[PDB]
Write a protein that binds this DNA or RNA. Structure first.
Ligand SMILES: [Mg+2]
Lengths: 320, 56, 103, 43, 102, 93, 56, 389, 49
RNA sequence: CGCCGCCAAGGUAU
């Protein structure tokens, strides 16, 4: 009798099969190669380390940060990765020699997040004072500084199709920018509690937003409120979305929640227990990412642990 | 018999020599000789005991 | 010496009431004879308001008579256990009840 | 029987709080050292 | 039309801001270049890699002494290798506190 | 010399005085302490005279310093002998 | 010159014991000019090495 | 310092809620061995020192000069050590007043206040520094200045209780190597008779001393009125900047008489390790004592195959000799519990390149199995609750 | 969803905030949940006898 | 078979 009730697509559930816990300091971000070999992560240990995806072994670690690492990403066109954190430094970690070659600097405050353009050699970075900034690779000069916010900007994404830059900030607004002129295209005001997670899908339009109160959904041209989701009332940090229609939201109380793209239906409502050293309430999901096959999910939580989920080859998980 | 301690005494003796040299901001062998060191307090000086001139 | 007369004790009470708890040099700067450590000793010995310096009871005595037999020494170990917490009133109770059991 | 203080089993084990079906790793050691690259270019 | 101090308004030819690494190394075909990304399955390869990686681990001397035999070394064995991230109770902290101080 | 890790001081200081100015400031500080404690406790009978000594007014008693007054809250309880004055003020309880 | 990354070599006691005791037939000591001539059978573990000219 | 002091109050908290780590019979048997040792040695107990003691000032002046030696520089502290030297010079001007004040502290006072701790930054070495209030420092200084001379007068200590009053290179070669070369048939090498030394440390010997068992042990040799005083001074509230934590199980060693406690605990650990018969062979009868390693009736020397022993403060040194069948039986008794051979790439000289390889220890299988076997054989008859090796 | 005032030892801020109550600022400043173990007795009299 | 060669900010307030 409910609207859009008979038509969700049946996603098989996710289950634990290995955990990765080697850090000494809060692990913060997860990135993965497009070549399905390993995945890179940073921590408050000031030691970025990569982990093999299949075997789980530690491939190598490397240090050099003065403060914690709040973002890490690897490029697809180029054989090197980028990292950033609260030491006011964005480091360009070469992978042919495991060293820093660029050492971006110019931010007047700390650095929260970063993102790459999939086609061209530019980079976007969201910081703590009020701004997001464009870093030009091969020049390491700030082309545009995006100054329209009144608080810190939590996450940032950019793509090839217009509009380019999506910045969700701690002054409870999102805005979508123009990468050419530097002025903003559209500002988006909802979410009484501030927005901390946006993501591209990447197949078709309708990107999503993330906030503690009534998590929403948007559109690429002209802006359009498509749908709001159910009562996921925890304070959240991360969103990750798959092309076949399943989505995952990672929060601060340890509760991570699955969704679907066809309807907006909460499927599993799974909670992660603590590995022995942690206390009763320390678990908070600060990173989550799929594989490039999107057959494996893996999260980095506030218990200094990466938990890895696979599928479940059963059938009796039907939607009521 | 212990050669590694005879090396350590030569390493640390010239190191405290250099520490007294940088207090004068001189660091010179010819301007600031070891005659300044190896002289007793009764005639004046600092007064130290040589183990670097032992031909390790 | 440390005679610890009441005219300095009430001043120390007012100094603990105004300034704080782990704030000892600033309140021993106004006594002309005492340092911080002796003021700490008396305030954790006599001037704390949770100290039950009187009203000896029956249950705590029968608690300590088979607690001073578990350990013959270590009266400061059993001082948070009893709740008398002065660590010298337990010694007075012990020698007084051993004088009453001998007479 | 009394337990000693120099081991002092303060916590439930990860295997008995996560189940025997999952894997746990206590990896704090690096193979493949800093000289050995990851890309291994055409040379 | 009136940019910041970095563009035109300054002659501060500052250190750490130089044309260093003015060429970009491109990921060629023997690595995981996107031309080989747009057609590979990514799913069977990870499955066979994890299946290949899962199989990698396959008298008349002391008759007067008091304690004749304690019969236990650790009372089970000495192989635990567990992980407690509470930094006061970690075994690395236990070795730190039993080695350096005495 | 280690100019950064030495016990330092500011120029033109003058230092700190002898015992006389130190315990003068100590007695003035204890005076301010006693006045603020009677301000919190709200005692209307504490009175200072024309020579820097303390007086209990219902007591009509002298006190040479601060702790002489602020130990006089337990002995010769005339504060309960003002019950007769309260009975004169009001014939019922 | 100053040495490079290959400062400390490490071989445990039983292996270099079975390799080297006072056992080799020595007639003359192997000089350093023999190794600078060619460091391949008189010296072990080479790297960052260049190879010189012989008999113009 | 914050980390070690919070770990110390955590282990003092975990001793109470978990009970004693020592078992009941584990302590009763130690007490029985000590009373058998004291009835064998006929060591009459230390009486209480009277007020009319004969050589009474002659120890108090020693204790006061021992305290006065540590004050030569006069860039000193504001109150505590200046009133320390003030109490020392008041004891100088009136010896009898401080002499009876020690007795006033010594009969009825067993609840003592804050002492302070600092650490020495000796760069991969740290010793704590416990500075105690001087009103207790004069008392326990006169206490151990009485107790050491009183214990060695009626020979409480066997000659292996070291460092004693000769010199330590006599302890090292000229009574030790001169001890081992003068033995009967030192090397024989034709019947499998071999010499072998062990050197170990009593790890955490200081902290793992329960004060109840300690008080019940040292009231046998010392009068109980000051034995309770000694085992009541061993716990105070350890003072720091913000952490005022008390003590219950581990003794603090910044006091004067704590060295006597350490050496008596070492002696009772020796008679747990060496037993009662071999120690009676080594130290001999009370009517005719022995030297450091000199023995009587050298046929007795050939028996009980461990040859000779010394105990530095927390470090024991054993020279011991085996024949063929005894060492074979000891190795085959060790190998019943330990499978998986050739696991001996750790023992002895593998990283210590201080000697050449012909001078270093070669790792032959029989010798390294004998070494690990006698390490196990000294690893037992020494339970984990008192010390560990 | 409110907060009590701060009863800190070092504050160096707005108000040190002394009421008549809020003095110990803990449960009892020290607690062991049983305060003793009975095996002490299994030691103690076992030595005594 | 033969190291090593020293300036300044750190203090006489703004
Ligand atoms: Mg200054």
């Amino acid at each position: 009798k409910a609207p859009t009730m008979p038509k969700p697509q049946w996603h098989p559930p996710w289950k634990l099969y290995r955990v990765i816990s080697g850090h000494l300091g809060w692990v913060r971000c997860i990135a993965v190669e497009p070549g399905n070999q390993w995945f890179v992560t940073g921590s408050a240990d000031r030691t970025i380390k990569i982990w093999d995806l299949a075997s789980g072994k530690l491939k190598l670690s490397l240090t050099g940060h003065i403060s914690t690492v709040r973002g890490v990403i690897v490029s697809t066109r180029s054989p090197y990765l980028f990292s950033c954190g609260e030491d006011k430094q964005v480091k360009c970690w070469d992978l042919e020699y495991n060293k820093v070659i660029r050492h971006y600097h110019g931010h007047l405050s700390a650095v929260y997040g970063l993102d790459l353009h999939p086609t061209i050699d530019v980079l976007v970075t969201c910081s703590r004072d009020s701004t997001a900034r464009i870093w030009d690779v091969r020049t390491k000069a700030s082309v545009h500084t995006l100054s329209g916010h009144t608080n810190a900007v939590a996450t940032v994404r950019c793509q090839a199709a217009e509009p380019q830059i999506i910045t969700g900030s701690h002054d409870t607004t999102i805005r979508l920018w123009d990468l050419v002129a530097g002025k903003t295209r559209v500002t988006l005001t909802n979410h009484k509690k501030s927005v901390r997670a946006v993501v591209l899908h990447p197949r078709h339009y309708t990107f999503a937003s993330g906030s503690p109160d009534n998590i929403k959904q948007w559109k690429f041209p002209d802006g359009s409120f498509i749908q709001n989701l159910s009562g996921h009332n925890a304070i959240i940090n991360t969103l990750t979305v798959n092309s076949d229609g399943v989505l995952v939201s990672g929060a601060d109380n340890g509760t991570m929640h699955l969704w679907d793209w066809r309807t907006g239906y909460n499927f599993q409502r799974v909670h992660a227990a603590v590995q022995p050293g942690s206390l009763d309430s320390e678990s908070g999901i600060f990173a989550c990412a799929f594989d490039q096959s999107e057959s494996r999910l893996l999260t980095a939580e506030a218990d200094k642990t990466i938990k890895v989920y696979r599928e479940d080859d059963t059938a009796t998980e039907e939607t009521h | 018999n212990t050669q590694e301690l005879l090396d350590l005494l030569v390493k640390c003796e010239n190191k405290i020599q250099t520490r007294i040299k940088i207090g004068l901001n001189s660091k010179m062998p010819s301007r600031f000789p070891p005659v300044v060191f190896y002289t007793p307090k009764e005639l004046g000086g600092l007064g130290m005991l040589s183990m670097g001139h032992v031909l390790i | 010496g440390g005679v610890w007369r009441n005219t300095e004790d009430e001043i120390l009470k007012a100094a603990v009431m105004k300034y704080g708890k782990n704030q000892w040099s600033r309140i021993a700067s106004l006594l002309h004879r005492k340092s911080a450590k002796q003021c700490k000793a008396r305030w954790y010995e006599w001037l704390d308001p949770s100290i039950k310096k009187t009203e000896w009871s029956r249950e705590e005595e029968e608690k300590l008579l088979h607690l001073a037999k578990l350990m013959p020494t270590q009266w400061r170990t059993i001082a948070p256990i009893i709740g008398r917490t002065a660590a010298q009133c337990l010694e007075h109770y012990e020698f007084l009840l051993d004088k009453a059991a001998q007479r | 029987e009394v337990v000693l203080h120099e081991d002092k089993k303060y916590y439930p084990t990860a295997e008995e709080v996560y189940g025997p079906e999952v894997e746990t790793i206590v990896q704090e050691e690096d193979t493949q050292p800093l000289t050995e690259p990851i890309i291994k270019p055409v040379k | 039309k009136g940019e910041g101090d970095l563009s035109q308004l300054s002659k501060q030819y500052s250190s750490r801001d130089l044309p260093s690494h003015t060429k970009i190394k491109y990921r060629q075909t023997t690595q995981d270049a996107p031309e080989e990304v747009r057609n590979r399955d990514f799913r069977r390869e990870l499955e066979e890699r994890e299946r290949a990686a899962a199989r990698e681990k396959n008298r008349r001397w002391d008759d007067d002494v008091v304690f004749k035999n304690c019969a236990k070394g650790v009372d089970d064995q000495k192989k635990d290798k567990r992980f407690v991230n509470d930094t006061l109770r970690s075994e690395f902290h236990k070795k730190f506190m039993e080695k350096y101080i005495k | 010399m280690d100019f950064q890790h030495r016990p330092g001081g500011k120029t033109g200081s003058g230092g700190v005085a002898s015992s006389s100015e130190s315990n003068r400031d100590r007695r003035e500080r204890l005076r301010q302490l006693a006045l603020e404690t009677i301000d919190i406790n709200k005692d209307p009978y504490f009175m200072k005279n024309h020579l820097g000594s303390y007086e209990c007014k219902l007591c009509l008693t002298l006190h040479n310093n601060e702790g002489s007054y602020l130990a006089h809250t337990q002995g010769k309880k005339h504060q309960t002998n003002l019950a007769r004055r309260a009975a004169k003020e009001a014939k019922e309880a | 010159f100053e040495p490079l990354v290959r400062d400390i070599n490490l071989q445990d006691e039983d292996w270099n014991e079975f390799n080297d005791i006072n056992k080799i037939i020595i007639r003359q000591p192997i000089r350093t000019e023999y190794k600078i001539a060619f460091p391949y059978l008189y010296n072990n573990l080479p790297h960052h090495v260049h190879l010189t000219w012989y008999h113009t | 310092t914050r980390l070690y002091l919070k770990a110390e109050q955590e282990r003092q908290h975990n001793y109470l809620k978990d009970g004693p780590y020592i078992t009941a019979e584990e302590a009763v048997a130690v007490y029985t061995t000590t009373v058998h040792w004291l009835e064998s040695r006929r060591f009459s107990p230390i009486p209480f020192p009277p007020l009319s003691y004969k050589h009474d000032t002659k120890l108090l002046i020693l204790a006061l000069e021992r305290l006065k030696e540590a004050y030569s520089v006069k860039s000193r502290l504001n109150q505590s050590q200046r009133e320390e030297l003030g109490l020392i010079e008041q004891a100088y001007d009136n010896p009898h007043e401080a002499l009876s004040r020690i007795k006033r502290h010594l009969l009825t006072q067993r609840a003592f206040k804050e002492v302070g701790i600092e650490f020495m930054d000796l760069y991969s070495h740290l010793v704590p520094v416990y500075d105690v209030e001087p009103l207790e420092k004069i008392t326990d200084a006169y206490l151990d200045q009485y107790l050491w001379y009183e214990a060695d007068k009626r020979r409480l200590f066997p000659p292996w209780i070291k460092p004693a009053d000769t010199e330590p290179p006599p302890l090292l070669v000229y009574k030790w190597c001169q001890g081992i070369n003068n033995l009967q048939d030192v090397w024989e090498t034709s019947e499998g008779e071999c010499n072998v030394m062990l050197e170990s440390r009593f790890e955490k010997m200081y902290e793992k001393i329960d004060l109840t068992l300690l008080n019940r042990l040292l009231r046998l040799i010392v009068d109980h009125n000051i034995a309770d005083y000694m085992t009541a001074k061993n716990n105070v509230v350890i003072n720091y900047k913000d952490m005022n934590h008390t003590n219950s199980y581990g003794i603090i060693r910044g006091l004067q008489f704590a060295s006597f406690i350490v050496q008596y605990y070492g002696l009772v650990m020796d008679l747990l390790v060496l037993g009662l018969h071999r120690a009676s062979e080594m130290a001999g009868p009370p009517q005719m004592p022995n030297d450091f390693l000199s023995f009587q009736d050298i046929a007795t020397e050939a028996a009980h195959p461990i040859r000779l022993f010394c105990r530095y403060i927390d470090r024991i040194h054993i020279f011991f000799r085996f024949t063929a069948d005894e060492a074979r039986d000891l190795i085959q008794r060790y190998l019943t519990e330990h499978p998986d051979p050739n696991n001996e790439n750790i023992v002895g000289y593998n990283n210590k390149k201080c000697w050449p390889r012909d001078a270093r220890m070669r790792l032959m299988k029989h010798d390294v199995n004998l070494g690990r076997a006698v390490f196990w054989d000294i690893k037992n008859r020494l339970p984990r609750s008192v010390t560990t090796v | 969803w409110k907060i009590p005032p701060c009863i800190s030892n070092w504050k160096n801020a707005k108000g040190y905030t002394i009421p008549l109550d809020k003095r110990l600022a803990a449960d009892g400043r020290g607690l062991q949940t049983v305060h003793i173990n009975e095996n002490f007795a299994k030691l103690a009299e076992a030595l005594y006898i």
